[PDB]
Amino acid sequence: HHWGYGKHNGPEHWHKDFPIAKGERQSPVDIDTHTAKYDPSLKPLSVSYDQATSLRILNNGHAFNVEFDDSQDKAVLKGGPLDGTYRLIQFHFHWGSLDGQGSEHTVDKKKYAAELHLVHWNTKYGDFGKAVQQPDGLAVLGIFLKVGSAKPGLQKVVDVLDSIKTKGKSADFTNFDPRGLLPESLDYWTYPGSLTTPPLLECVTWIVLKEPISVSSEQVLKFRKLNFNGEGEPEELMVDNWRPAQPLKNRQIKASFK
Ligand SMILES: NS(=O)(=O)c1ccc(C(=O)NCc2c(F)cccc2F)cc1
Ligand SMILES: [Hg+2]
Ligand SMILES: [Zn+2]
């Protein structure tokens, strides 16, 4: 049936319907800090989210996405290893059933409690659908979440989760500022990869921030109360919706710092 994160339809089965799962540039990967190459020609990241217009938050059965209006250059990502402008279309998280797991990428094999993905698409391609048919169509900003103190900027997201408990449910979510989810430093690692969920298209330039943000135990607890199932079906808690790290193969992870 449809792919999932369970025993019978999880990551290890995806290859059957999406053969690209065993490709050459799959994500996520483990970031070996001692092997990453400091590249002094990498420009600083430019995050312009001052004009961001959030619209809706939705539970799609795999995670919850906060969608933005990408009809024009309102919230964009430029600089870093990117060429051209990339528009923010949505952000979502991957998290675990326990605090010691949840992130997709790992640093020196270390797993974080969750990982935030800010999905952007290259404006040169006209629309998101075209962008996903190109090796440089997407840019995803990956941010790690570690359990500690509450992140004020995340609370609005946490408060609306009750409204979208089950698959298919959505709630209007305007005036949310994504800048409140950013760590203080924009230092990062970057490597060419893919979507971490089917169809696993290899169209992504991954930019993983070095500094993680802190969220309270109660904040991530609320993520865990979401459901994979739709209303009226047997309850399956939405936890551990992350894909294990893939082989790096012939790729180099570059760092923007030393
Ligand atoms: N975890 S992650 O790598 O950042 C990521 C980001 C975006 C998407 C997505 O937009 N799905 C849409 C989509 C389809 F549903 C079908 C075909 C192409 C797509 F882009 C999936 C995974
Ligand atoms: Hg592609
Ligand atoms: Zn993701």
Side-chain angles (χ1 to χ4, degrees), residues 18-27 131-138 191-206 243 246-249 251:
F18 307 91
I20 201 163
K22 288 172 185 306
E24 299 304 309
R25 45 173 287 195
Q26 289 290 292
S27 296
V132 301
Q133 295 177 11
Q134 306 280 177
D136 62 344
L138 297 189
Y191 78 97
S194 67
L195 301 173
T196 63
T197 59
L200 308 159
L201 302 179
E202 297 176 326
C203 308
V204 186
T205 290
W206 275 98
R243 179 183 195 197
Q246 301 303 299
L248 194 57
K249 303 278 227 288
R251 283 178 289 178

PDB file of all heavy atoms in Angstrom, residues 18-27 131-138 191-206 243 246-249 251:
ATOM      1  N   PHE A  18      10.028   2.880  -5.639  1.00  0.00           N
ATOM      2  CA  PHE A  18      10.837   4.045  -6.028  1.00  0.00           C
ATOM      3  C   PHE A  18      12.265   3.562  -6.094  1.00  0.00           C
ATOM      4  O   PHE A  18      13.024   3.667  -5.134  1.00  0.00           O
ATOM      5  CB  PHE A  18      10.697   5.176  -5.007  1.00  0.00           C
ATOM      6  CG  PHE A  18       9.272   5.543  -4.727  1.00  0.00           C
ATOM      7  CD1 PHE A  18       8.576   4.931  -3.688  1.00  0.00           C
ATOM      8  CD2 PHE A  18       8.593   6.416  -5.568  1.00  0.00           C
ATOM      9  CE1 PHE A  18       7.221   5.175  -3.499  1.00  0.00           C
ATOM     10  CE2 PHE A  18       7.228   6.666  -5.382  1.00  0.00           C
ATOM     11  CZ  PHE A  18       6.545   6.039  -4.345  1.00  0.00           C
ATOM     12  N   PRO A  19      12.626   2.945  -7.219  1.00  0.00           N
ATOM     13  CA  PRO A  19      13.979   2.431  -7.391  1.00  0.00           C
ATOM     14  C   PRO A  19      15.112   3.453  -7.167  1.00  0.00           C
ATOM     15  O   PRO A  19      16.240   3.077  -6.797  1.00  0.00           O
ATOM     16  CB  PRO A  19      13.941   1.842  -8.807  1.00  0.00           C
ATOM     17  CG  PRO A  19      12.732   2.489  -9.451  1.00  0.00           C
ATOM     18  CD  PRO A  19      11.761   2.554  -8.346  1.00  0.00           C
ATOM     19  N   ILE A  20      14.803   4.743  -7.291  1.00  0.00           N
ATOM     20  CA  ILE A  20      15.830   5.762  -7.090  1.00  0.00           C
ATOM     21  C   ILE A  20      16.345   5.736  -5.646  1.00  0.00           C
ATOM     22  O   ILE A  20      17.410   6.279  -5.363  1.00  0.00           O
ATOM     23  CB  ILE A  20      15.337   7.176  -7.473  1.00  0.00           C
ATOM     24  CG1 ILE A  20      16.547   8.079  -7.755  1.00  0.00           C
ATOM     25  CG2 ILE A  20      14.452   7.750  -6.365  1.00  0.00           C
ATOM     26  CD1 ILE A  20      16.238   9.351  -8.514  1.00  0.00           C
ATOM     27  N   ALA A  21      15.621   5.051  -4.757  1.00  0.00           N
ATOM     28  CA  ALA A  21      16.016   4.932  -3.358  1.00  0.00           C
ATOM     29  C   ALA A  21      17.467   4.453  -3.213  1.00  0.00           C
ATOM     30  O   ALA A  21      18.128   4.757  -2.227  1.00  0.00           O
ATOM     31  CB  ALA A  21      15.076   3.965  -2.615  1.00  0.00           C
ATOM     32  N   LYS A  22      17.954   3.697  -4.193  1.00  0.00           N
ATOM     33  CA  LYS A  22      19.322   3.182  -4.150  1.00  0.00           C
ATOM     34  C   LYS A  22      20.254   3.986  -5.049  1.00  0.00           C
ATOM     35  O   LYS A  22      21.313   3.500  -5.432  1.00  0.00           O
ATOM     36  CB  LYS A  22      19.341   1.718  -4.594  1.00  0.00           C
ATOM     37  CG  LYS A  22      18.748   0.730  -3.613  1.00  0.00           C
ATOM     38  CD  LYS A  22      18.661  -0.649  -4.261  1.00  0.00           C
ATOM     39  CE  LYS A  22      17.952  -1.657  -3.372  1.00  0.00           C
ATOM     40  NZ  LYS A  22      18.572  -1.733  -2.024  1.00  0.00           N
ATOM     41  N   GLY A  23      19.858   5.215  -5.366  1.00  0.00           N
ATOM     42  CA  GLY A  23      20.641   6.068  -6.242  1.00  0.00           C
ATOM     43  C   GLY A  23      21.989   6.552  -5.745  1.00  0.00           C
ATOM     44  O   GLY A  23      22.433   6.178  -4.678  1.00  0.00           O
ATOM     45  N   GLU A  24      22.603   7.442  -6.521  1.00  0.00           N
ATOM     46  CA  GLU A  24      23.925   7.998  -6.222  1.00  0.00           C
ATOM     47  C   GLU A  24      23.961   9.235  -5.332  1.00  0.00           C
ATOM     48  O   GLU A  24      25.008   9.560  -4.796  1.00  0.00           O
ATOM     49  CB  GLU A  24      24.675   8.316  -7.522  1.00  0.00           C
ATOM     50  CG  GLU A  24      24.934   7.103  -8.411  1.00  0.00           C
ATOM     51  CD  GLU A  24      25.694   5.985  -7.695  1.00  0.00           C
ATOM     52  OE1 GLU A  24      26.761   6.267  -7.088  1.00  0.00           O
ATOM     53  OE2 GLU A  24      25.223   4.822  -7.747  1.00  0.00           O
ATOM     54  N   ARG A  25      22.859   9.980  -5.247  1.00  0.00           N
ATOM     55  CA  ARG A  25      22.849  11.156  -4.390  1.00  0.00           C
ATOM     56  C   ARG A  25      21.630  11.229  -3.479  1.00  0.00           C
ATOM     57  O   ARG A  25      20.903  12.220  -3.466  1.00  0.00           O
ATOM     58  CB  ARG A  25      23.064  12.448  -5.191  1.00  0.00           C
ATOM     59  CG  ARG A  25      22.272  12.594  -6.466  1.00  0.00           C
ATOM     60  CD  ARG A  25      22.442  13.999  -7.075  1.00  0.00           C
ATOM     61  NE  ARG A  25      21.741  15.050  -6.330  1.00  0.00           N
ATOM     62  CZ  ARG A  25      21.491  16.274  -6.801  1.00  0.00           C
ATOM     63  NH1 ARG A  25      21.881  16.628  -8.020  1.00  0.00           N
ATOM     64  NH2 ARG A  25      20.835  17.151  -6.060  1.00  0.00           N
ATOM     65  N   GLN A  26      21.443  10.177  -2.687  1.00  0.00           N
ATOM     66  CA  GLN A  26      20.319  10.082  -1.757  1.00  0.00           C
ATOM     67  C   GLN A  26      20.604  10.747  -0.422  1.00  0.00           C
ATOM     68  O   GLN A  26      21.766  10.895  -0.017  1.00  0.00           O
ATOM     69  CB  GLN A  26      19.940   8.619  -1.533  1.00  0.00           C
ATOM     70  CG  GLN A  26      19.273   7.993  -2.742  1.00  0.00           C
ATOM     71  CD  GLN A  26      17.894   8.563  -2.955  1.00  0.00           C
ATOM     72  OE1 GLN A  26      16.993   8.336  -2.147  1.00  0.00           O
ATOM     73  NE2 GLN A  26      17.720   9.342  -4.025  1.00  0.00           N
ATOM     74  N   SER A  27      19.541  11.215   0.223  1.00  0.00           N
ATOM     75  CA  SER A  27      19.656  11.858   1.511  1.00  0.00           C
ATOM     76  C   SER A  27      18.746  11.092   2.447  1.00  0.00           C
ATOM     77  O   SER A  27      17.799  10.441   1.988  1.00  0.00           O
ATOM     78  CB  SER A  27      19.195  13.306   1.414  1.00  0.00           C
ATOM     79  OG  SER A  27      20.048  14.033   0.557  1.00  0.00           O
ATOM     80  N   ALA A 131      10.657  22.533 -11.145  1.00  0.00           N
ATOM     81  CA  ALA A 131      11.854  22.518 -10.313  1.00  0.00           C
ATOM     82  C   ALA A 131      12.275  21.112  -9.905  1.00  0.00           C
ATOM     83  O   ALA A 131      13.469  20.812  -9.870  1.00  0.00           O
ATOM     84  CB  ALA A 131      11.650  23.400  -9.067  1.00  0.00           C
ATOM     85  N   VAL A 132      11.309  20.239  -9.622  1.00  0.00           N
ATOM     86  CA  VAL A 132      11.626  18.875  -9.219  1.00  0.00           C
ATOM     87  C   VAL A 132      12.025  17.937 -10.361  1.00  0.00           C
ATOM     88  O   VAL A 132      12.096  16.714 -10.183  1.00  0.00           O
ATOM     89  CB  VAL A 132      10.507  18.241  -8.359  1.00  0.00           C
ATOM     90  CG1 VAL A 132      10.280  19.082  -7.118  1.00  0.00           C
ATOM     91  CG2 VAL A 132       9.209  18.081  -9.166  1.00  0.00           C
ATOM     92  N   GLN A 133      12.268  18.486 -11.542  1.00  0.00           N
ATOM     93  CA  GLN A 133      12.704  17.659 -12.670  1.00  0.00           C
ATOM     94  C   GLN A 133      14.121  18.135 -13.044  1.00  0.00           C
ATOM     95  O   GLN A 133      14.606  17.884 -14.137  1.00  0.00           O
ATOM     96  CB  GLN A 133      11.723  17.805 -13.858  1.00  0.00           C
ATOM     97  CG  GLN A 133      10.314  17.270 -13.581  1.00  0.00           C
ATOM     98  CD  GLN A 133       9.333  17.476 -14.736  1.00  0.00           C
ATOM     99  OE1 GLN A 133       9.710  17.840 -15.851  1.00  0.00           O
ATOM    100  NE2 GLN A 133       8.060  17.224 -14.467  1.00  0.00           N
ATOM    101  N   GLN A 134      14.793  18.772 -12.092  1.00  0.00           N
ATOM    102  CA  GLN A 134      16.115  19.350 -12.328  1.00  0.00           C
ATOM    103  C   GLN A 134      17.077  19.083 -11.184  1.00  0.00           C
ATOM    104  O   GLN A 134      16.720  19.289 -10.021  1.00  0.00           O
ATOM    105  CB  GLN A 134      15.960  20.864 -12.510  1.00  0.00           C
ATOM    106  CG  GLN A 134      14.959  21.261 -13.594  1.00  0.00           C
ATOM    107  CD  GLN A 134      15.536  21.183 -14.999  1.00  0.00           C
ATOM    108  OE1 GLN A 134      14.834  21.420 -15.971  1.00  0.00           O
ATOM    109  NE2 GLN A 134      16.826  20.909 -15.109  1.00  0.00           N
ATOM    110  N   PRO A 135      18.360  18.818 -11.505  1.00  0.00           N
ATOM    111  CA  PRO A 135      19.391  18.531 -10.497  1.00  0.00           C
ATOM    112  C   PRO A 135      19.620  19.673  -9.486  1.00  0.00           C
ATOM    113  O   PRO A 135      20.106  19.445  -8.380  1.00  0.00           O
ATOM    114  CB  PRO A 135      20.619  18.221 -11.339  1.00  0.00           C
ATOM    115  CG  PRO A 135      20.452  19.119 -12.524  1.00  0.00           C
ATOM    116  CD  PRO A 135      18.966  19.077 -12.827  1.00  0.00           C
ATOM    117  N   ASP A 136      19.259  20.896  -9.853  1.00  0.00           N
ATOM    118  CA  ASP A 136      19.410  22.008  -8.926  1.00  0.00           C
ATOM    119  C   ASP A 136      18.070  22.742  -8.719  1.00  0.00           C
ATOM    120  O   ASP A 136      18.028  23.961  -8.523  1.00  0.00           O
ATOM    121  CB  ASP A 136      20.488  22.967  -9.418  1.00  0.00           C
ATOM    122  CG  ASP A 136      20.146  23.589 -10.735  1.00  0.00           C
ATOM    123  OD1 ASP A 136      19.248  23.081 -11.436  1.00  0.00           O
ATOM    124  OD2 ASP A 136      20.786  24.605 -11.067  1.00  0.00           O
ATOM    125  N   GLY A 137      16.989  21.971  -8.705  1.00  0.00           N
ATOM    126  CA  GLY A 137      15.671  22.546  -8.549  1.00  0.00           C
ATOM    127  C   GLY A 137      15.283  22.973  -7.155  1.00  0.00           C
ATOM    128  O   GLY A 137      14.511  23.931  -6.995  1.00  0.00           O
ATOM    129  N   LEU A 138      15.802  22.279  -6.149  1.00  0.00           N
ATOM    130  CA  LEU A 138      15.461  22.581  -4.767  1.00  0.00           C
ATOM    131  C   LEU A 138      16.617  22.881  -3.848  1.00  0.00           C
ATOM    132  O   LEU A 138      17.727  22.414  -4.053  1.00  0.00           O
ATOM    133  CB  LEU A 138      14.728  21.406  -4.153  1.00  0.00           C
ATOM    134  CG  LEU A 138      13.377  20.976  -4.706  1.00  0.00           C
ATOM    135  CD1 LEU A 138      12.822  19.936  -3.755  1.00  0.00           C
ATOM    136  CD2 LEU A 138      12.414  22.168  -4.817  1.00  0.00           C
ATOM    137  N   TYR A 191      25.826  19.750   0.536  1.00  0.00           N
ATOM    138  CA  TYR A 191      26.146  18.619  -0.342  1.00  0.00           C
ATOM    139  C   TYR A 191      24.927  18.380  -1.252  1.00  0.00           C
ATOM    140  O   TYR A 191      23.809  18.770  -0.893  1.00  0.00           O
ATOM    141  CB  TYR A 191      26.474  17.355   0.497  1.00  0.00           C
ATOM    142  CG  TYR A 191      25.252  16.648   1.065  1.00  0.00           C
ATOM    143  CD1 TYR A 191      24.691  15.538   0.414  1.00  0.00           C
ATOM    144  CD2 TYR A 191      24.607  17.135   2.204  1.00  0.00           C
ATOM    145  CE1 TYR A 191      23.513  14.947   0.877  1.00  0.00           C
ATOM    146  CE2 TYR A 191      23.435  16.543   2.672  1.00  0.00           C
ATOM    147  CZ  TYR A 191      22.898  15.459   2.002  1.00  0.00           C
ATOM    148  OH  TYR A 191      21.725  14.910   2.455  1.00  0.00           O
ATOM    149  N   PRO A 192      25.133  17.839  -2.471  1.00  0.00           N
ATOM    150  CA  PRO A 192      24.010  17.572  -3.391  1.00  0.00           C
ATOM    151  C   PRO A 192      23.307  16.283  -2.960  1.00  0.00           C
ATOM    152  O   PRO A 192      23.965  15.272  -2.745  1.00  0.00           O
ATOM    153  CB  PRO A 192      24.705  17.407  -4.737  1.00  0.00           C
ATOM    154  CG  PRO A 192      26.016  16.803  -4.360  1.00  0.00           C
ATOM    155  CD  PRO A 192      26.425  17.596  -3.138  1.00  0.00           C
ATOM    156  N   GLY A 193      21.985  16.321  -2.829  1.00  0.00           N
ATOM    157  CA  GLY A 193      21.255  15.152  -2.370  1.00  0.00           C
ATOM    158  C   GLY A 193      19.861  14.999  -2.957  1.00  0.00           C
ATOM    159  O   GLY A 193      19.605  15.372  -4.111  1.00  0.00           O
ATOM    160  N   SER A 194      18.930  14.513  -2.142  1.00  0.00           N
ATOM    161  CA  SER A 194      17.583  14.265  -2.632  1.00  0.00           C
ATOM    162  C   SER A 194      16.498  14.515  -1.568  1.00  0.00           C
ATOM    163  O   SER A 194      16.807  14.857  -0.425  1.00  0.00           O
ATOM    164  CB  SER A 194      17.511  12.799  -3.005  1.00  0.00           C
ATOM    165  OG  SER A 194      17.625  12.038  -1.815  1.00  0.00           O
ATOM    166  N   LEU A 195      15.231  14.354  -1.968  1.00  0.00           N
ATOM    167  CA  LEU A 195      14.092  14.449  -1.035  1.00  0.00           C
ATOM    168  C   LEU A 195      14.316  13.234  -0.112  1.00  0.00           C
ATOM    169  O   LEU A 195      14.867  12.212  -0.564  1.00  0.00           O
ATOM    170  CB  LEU A 195      12.760  14.251  -1.784  1.00  0.00           C
ATOM    171  CG  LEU A 195      12.429  15.227  -2.924  1.00  0.00           C
ATOM    172  CD1 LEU A 195      11.169  14.771  -3.647  1.00  0.00           C
ATOM    173  CD2 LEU A 195      12.266  16.650  -2.382  1.00  0.00           C
ATOM    174  N   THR A 196      13.901  13.316   1.154  1.00  0.00           N
ATOM    175  CA  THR A 196      14.101  12.186   2.053  1.00  0.00           C
ATOM    176  C   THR A 196      12.867  11.302   2.151  1.00  0.00           C
ATOM    177  O   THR A 196      12.826  10.356   2.955  1.00  0.00           O
ATOM    178  CB  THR A 196      14.513  12.639   3.444  1.00  0.00           C
ATOM    179  OG1 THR A 196      13.466  13.423   4.025  1.00  0.00           O
ATOM    180  CG2 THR A 196      15.784  13.457   3.375  1.00  0.00           C
ATOM    181  N   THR A 197      11.843  11.642   1.369  1.00  0.00           N
ATOM    182  CA  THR A 197      10.612  10.866   1.333  1.00  0.00           C
ATOM    183  C   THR A 197      10.297  10.587  -0.138  1.00  0.00           C
ATOM    184  O   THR A 197      10.790  11.298  -1.049  1.00  0.00           O
ATOM    185  CB  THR A 197       9.426  11.629   1.983  1.00  0.00           C
ATOM    186  OG1 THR A 197       9.216  12.857   1.296  1.00  0.00           O
ATOM    187  CG2 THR A 197       9.712  11.951   3.441  1.00  0.00           C
ATOM    188  N   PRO A 198       9.554   9.497  -0.407  1.00  0.00           N
ATOM    189  CA  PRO A 198       9.215   9.197  -1.802  1.00  0.00           C
ATOM    190  C   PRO A 198       8.575  10.456  -2.393  1.00  0.00           C
ATOM    191  O   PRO A 198       7.863  11.179  -1.689  1.00  0.00           O
ATOM    192  CB  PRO A 198       8.208   8.051  -1.661  1.00  0.00           C
ATOM    193  CG  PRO A 198       8.731   7.299  -0.476  1.00  0.00           C
ATOM    194  CD  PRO A 198       9.093   8.425   0.495  1.00  0.00           C
ATOM    195  N   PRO A 199       8.768  10.710  -3.696  1.00  0.00           N
ATOM    196  CA  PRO A 199       9.515   9.949  -4.702  1.00  0.00           C
ATOM    197  C   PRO A 199      11.058   9.970  -4.660  1.00  0.00           C
ATOM    198  O   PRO A 199      11.707   9.472  -5.586  1.00  0.00           O
ATOM    199  CB  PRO A 199       8.958  10.502  -6.007  1.00  0.00           C
ATOM    200  CG  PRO A 199       8.721  11.923  -5.671  1.00  0.00           C
ATOM    201  CD  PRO A 199       8.097  11.868  -4.308  1.00  0.00           C
ATOM    202  N   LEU A 200      11.630  10.570  -3.611  1.00  0.00           N
ATOM    203  CA  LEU A 200      13.083  10.615  -3.412  1.00  0.00           C
ATOM    204  C   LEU A 200      13.874  11.190  -4.593  1.00  0.00           C
ATOM    205  O   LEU A 200      14.996  10.748  -4.877  1.00  0.00           O
ATOM    206  CB  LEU A 200      13.591   9.208  -3.099  1.00  0.00           C
ATOM    207  CG  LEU A 200      12.898   8.437  -1.975  1.00  0.00           C
ATOM    208  CD1 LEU A 200      13.156   6.942  -2.165  1.00  0.00           C
ATOM    209  CD2 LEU A 200      13.382   8.932  -0.600  1.00  0.00           C
ATOM    210  N   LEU A 201      13.306  12.198  -5.248  1.00  0.00           N
ATOM    211  CA  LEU A 201      13.939  12.824  -6.410  1.00  0.00           C
ATOM    212  C   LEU A 201      15.279  13.476  -6.044  1.00  0.00           C
ATOM    213  O   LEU A 201      15.400  14.134  -5.014  1.00  0.00           O
ATOM    214  CB  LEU A 201      12.968  13.836  -7.045  1.00  0.00           C
ATOM    215  CG  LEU A 201      11.633  13.186  -7.462  1.00  0.00           C
ATOM    216  CD1 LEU A 201      10.683  14.203  -8.051  1.00  0.00           C
ATOM    217  CD2 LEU A 201      11.907  12.083  -8.491  1.00  0.00           C
ATOM    218  N   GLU A 202      16.295  13.271  -6.872  1.00  0.00           N
ATOM    219  CA  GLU A 202      17.599  13.826  -6.608  1.00  0.00           C
ATOM    220  C   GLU A 202      17.708  15.214  -7.215  1.00  0.00           C
ATOM    221  O   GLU A 202      18.455  15.455  -8.167  1.00  0.00           O
ATOM    222  CB  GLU A 202      18.641  12.852  -7.148  1.00  0.00           C
ATOM    223  CG  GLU A 202      18.554  11.511  -6.418  1.00  0.00           C
ATOM    224  CD  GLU A 202      19.495  10.441  -6.941  1.00  0.00           C
ATOM    225  OE1 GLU A 202      19.753  10.410  -8.168  1.00  0.00           O
ATOM    226  OE2 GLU A 202      19.950   9.607  -6.118  1.00  0.00           O
ATOM    227  N   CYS A 203      17.026  16.157  -6.592  1.00  0.00           N
ATOM    228  CA  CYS A 203      16.997  17.524  -7.087  1.00  0.00           C
ATOM    229  C   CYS A 203      17.351  18.564  -6.012  1.00  0.00           C
ATOM    230  O   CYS A 203      17.227  19.768  -6.225  1.00  0.00           O
ATOM    231  CB  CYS A 203      15.590  17.761  -7.628  1.00  0.00           C
ATOM    232  SG  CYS A 203      15.137  16.442  -8.808  1.00  0.00           S
ATOM    233  N   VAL A 204      17.931  18.102  -4.912  1.00  0.00           N
ATOM    234  CA  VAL A 204      18.210  19.005  -3.801  1.00  0.00           C
ATOM    235  C   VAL A 204      19.634  19.399  -3.403  1.00  0.00           C
ATOM    236  O   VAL A 204      20.537  18.556  -3.329  1.00  0.00           O
ATOM    237  CB  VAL A 204      17.526  18.461  -2.521  1.00  0.00           C
ATOM    238  CG1 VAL A 204      17.667  19.468  -1.349  1.00  0.00           C
ATOM    239  CG2 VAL A 204      16.081  18.142  -2.808  1.00  0.00           C
ATOM    240  N   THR A 205      19.825  20.694  -3.161  1.00  0.00           N
ATOM    241  CA  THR A 205      21.095  21.190  -2.651  1.00  0.00           C
ATOM    242  C   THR A 205      20.787  21.331  -1.171  1.00  0.00           C
ATOM    243  O   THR A 205      19.917  22.113  -0.763  1.00  0.00           O
ATOM    244  CB  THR A 205      21.492  22.544  -3.208  1.00  0.00           C
ATOM    245  OG1 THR A 205      21.844  22.394  -4.583  1.00  0.00           O
ATOM    246  CG2 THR A 205      22.703  23.076  -2.476  1.00  0.00           C
ATOM    247  N   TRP A 206      21.409  20.479  -0.381  1.00  0.00           N
ATOM    248  CA  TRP A 206      21.184  20.503   1.031  1.00  0.00           C
ATOM    249  C   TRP A 206      22.113  21.490   1.713  1.00  0.00           C
ATOM    250  O   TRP A 206      23.312  21.518   1.422  1.00  0.00           O
ATOM    251  CB  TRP A 206      21.373  19.096   1.589  1.00  0.00           C
ATOM    252  CG  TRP A 206      20.151  18.271   1.490  1.00  0.00           C
ATOM    253  CD1 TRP A 206      19.859  17.348   0.533  1.00  0.00           C
ATOM    254  CD2 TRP A 206      19.039  18.278   2.403  1.00  0.00           C
ATOM    255  NE1 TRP A 206      18.621  16.773   0.792  1.00  0.00           N
ATOM    256  CE2 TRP A 206      18.104  17.325   1.936  1.00  0.00           C
ATOM    257  CE3 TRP A 206      18.748  18.996   3.571  1.00  0.00           C
ATOM    258  CZ2 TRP A 206      16.891  17.071   2.601  1.00  0.00           C
ATOM    259  CZ3 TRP A 206      17.542  18.745   4.238  1.00  0.00           C
ATOM    260  CH2 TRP A 206      16.630  17.789   3.751  1.00  0.00           C
ATOM    261  N   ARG A 243      14.024   9.042   7.814  1.00  0.00           N
ATOM    262  CA  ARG A 243      14.714   8.042   7.009  1.00  0.00           C
ATOM    263  C   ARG A 243      16.134   7.946   7.517  1.00  0.00           C
ATOM    264  O   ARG A 243      16.756   8.960   7.806  1.00  0.00           O
ATOM    265  CB  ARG A 243      14.757   8.482   5.541  1.00  0.00           C
ATOM    266  CG  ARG A 243      15.470   7.519   4.623  1.00  0.00           C
ATOM    267  CD  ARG A 243      15.533   8.047   3.190  1.00  0.00           C
ATOM    268  NE  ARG A 243      15.894   6.954   2.285  1.00  0.00           N
ATOM    269  CZ  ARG A 243      16.350   7.105   1.046  1.00  0.00           C
ATOM    270  NH1 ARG A 243      16.518   8.318   0.529  1.00  0.00           N
ATOM    271  NH2 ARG A 243      16.627   6.032   0.316  1.00  0.00           N
ATOM    272  N   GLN A 246      21.909   7.604   4.468  1.00  0.00           N
ATOM    273  CA  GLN A 246      22.278   6.866   3.266  1.00  0.00           C
ATOM    274  C   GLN A 246      23.779   6.938   2.942  1.00  0.00           C
ATOM    275  O   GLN A 246      24.506   7.772   3.486  1.00  0.00           O
ATOM    276  CB  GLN A 246      21.470   7.403   2.084  1.00  0.00           C
ATOM    277  CG  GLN A 246      19.984   7.285   2.260  1.00  0.00           C
ATOM    278  CD  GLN A 246      19.550   5.858   2.503  1.00  0.00           C
ATOM    279  OE1 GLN A 246      19.755   4.986   1.663  1.00  0.00           O
ATOM    280  NE2 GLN A 246      18.982   5.603   3.668  1.00  0.00           N
ATOM    281  N   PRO A 247      24.265   6.043   2.062  1.00  0.00           N
ATOM    282  CA  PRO A 247      25.679   6.031   1.685  1.00  0.00           C
ATOM    283  C   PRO A 247      26.042   7.329   0.974  1.00  0.00           C
ATOM    284  O   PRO A 247      25.317   7.769   0.083  1.00  0.00           O
ATOM    285  CB  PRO A 247      25.758   4.862   0.694  1.00  0.00           C
ATOM    286  CG  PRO A 247      24.650   3.988   1.086  1.00  0.00           C
ATOM    287  CD  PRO A 247      23.546   4.966   1.369  1.00  0.00           C
ATOM    288  N   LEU A 248      27.180   7.909   1.341  1.00  0.00           N
ATOM    289  CA  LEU A 248      27.642   9.148   0.721  1.00  0.00           C
ATOM    290  C   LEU A 248      28.093   8.941  -0.730  1.00  0.00           C
ATOM    291  O   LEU A 248      27.995   9.861  -1.536  1.00  0.00           O
ATOM    292  CB  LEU A 248      28.776   9.757   1.549  1.00  0.00           C
ATOM    293  CG  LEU A 248      29.190  11.202   1.285  1.00  0.00           C
ATOM    294  CD1 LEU A 248      28.012  12.156   1.453  1.00  0.00           C
ATOM    295  CD2 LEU A 248      30.319  11.543   2.244  1.00  0.00           C
ATOM    296  N   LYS A 249      28.594   7.744  -1.051  1.00  0.00           N
ATOM    297  CA  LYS A 249      29.052   7.398  -2.407  1.00  0.00           C
ATOM    298  C   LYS A 249      30.150   8.358  -2.884  1.00  0.00           C
ATOM    299  O   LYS A 249      31.154   8.559  -2.198  1.00  0.00           O
ATOM    300  CB  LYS A 249      27.884   7.412  -3.406  1.00  0.00           C
ATOM    301  CG  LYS A 249      26.700   6.498  -3.064  1.00  0.00           C
ATOM    302  CD  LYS A 249      26.950   5.068  -3.487  1.00  0.00           C
ATOM    303  CE  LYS A 249      25.748   4.470  -4.240  1.00  0.00           C
ATOM    304  NZ  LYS A 249      24.542   4.170  -3.418  1.00  0.00           N
ATOM    305  N   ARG A 251      30.419  11.739  -3.121  1.00  0.00           N
ATOM    306  CA  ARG A 251      30.048  13.106  -2.803  1.00  0.00           C
ATOM    307  C   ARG A 251      30.961  13.673  -1.734  1.00  0.00           C
ATOM    308  O   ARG A 251      31.516  12.950  -0.910  1.00  0.00           O
ATOM    309  CB  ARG A 251      28.591  13.181  -2.325  1.00  0.00           C
ATOM    310  CG  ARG A 251      27.555  13.096  -3.422  1.00  0.00           C
ATOM    311  CD  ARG A 251      26.170  13.138  -2.810  1.00  0.00           C
ATOM    312  NE  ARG A 251      25.843  11.899  -2.098  1.00  0.00           N
ATOM    313  CZ  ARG A 251      24.705  11.704  -1.433  1.00  0.00           C
ATOM    314  NH1 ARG A 251      23.799  12.671  -1.364  1.00  0.00           N
ATOM    315  NH2 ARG A 251      24.418  10.508  -0.941  1.00  0.00           N
TER     316      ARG A 251
END
